[PDB]
Ligand SMILES: C[S@@+](CC[C@H](N)C(=O)[O-])C[C@H]1O[C@@H](n2cnc3c(N)ncnc32)[C@H](O)[C@@H]1O
Ligand SMILES: O=[N+]([O-])c1cc(O)c(O)c([N+](=O)[O-])c1
């Protein structure tokens with residue numbers, strides 16, 4: 637992950653220590669202009685922000701951390717005592733994520749777990765003291781969105797009103813997830829049309845609110 641280290645080094649050299657906004661701006665400018673990277677980004681980040689502002693989650697699970705952009709972005713909006721648990725399968729990306737979170741001033745809100753989402757999710761109650769989740773941000777490999785959604789449900793981690801928010805439902809796309817949550821009476825869905833981070837290709841997020849196993 638040479639590019640990812642470069643992004644981190646750019647942030648460490650140019651952003652302001654302890655300042656989450658400064659970190660996000662440094663990443664977004666670097667990535668838009670110099671080296672594209674799969675961060676949720678600023679435009680779609682504003683939709684993520686709005687969802688968190690509307691629903692005010694205190695326990696938030698992120699699937700897929702990468703360099704920590706979205707962890708920093710979401711953590712900046714959370715109340716005291718809130719927990720953002722973020723799961724990242726790649727140890728080198730997790731290491732960057734932790735540096736990024738520490739530098740941004742938000743480490744006290746974030747718990748990073750190195751591992752595959754499908755291994756970690758069944759451990760969240762017993763090993764991470766989770767009860768249920770208020771919100772989940774899905775932004776890992778898209779072929780995991782549907783299986784992890786069903787796993788979350790099976791493991792008893794969703795309550796009525798738990799908000800799923802999925803990135804990239806149009807590009808690269810998550811068609812099997814979308815078909816499921818839209819067609820299922822167990823999820824109330826809203827689609828937010830936007831763009832591929834840093835670019836003009838159309839993309840979107842799906843917000844799917846769990847309605848219980850009905
Ligand atoms: C799109 S990047 C996440 C971007 C991040 N949410 C952001 O906006 O800054 C996707 C990440 O998912 C991770 N990933 C892929 N499969 C995963 C899995 N099964 N469990 C956890 N992380 C996984 C990849 O290593 C990669 O870092
Ligand atoms: O290829 N891409 O444009 C992306 C974009 C993204 O925002 C991703 O999250 C992604 N992925 O997780 O594979 C891929």
Ligand SMILES: [Cl-]
Pocket residue numbers: 676677678679680832833834835
């Ligand atoms: Cl953007």
Ligand SMILES: [Mg+2]
Pocket residue numbers: 674675676775803804
């Ligand atoms: Mg994405």
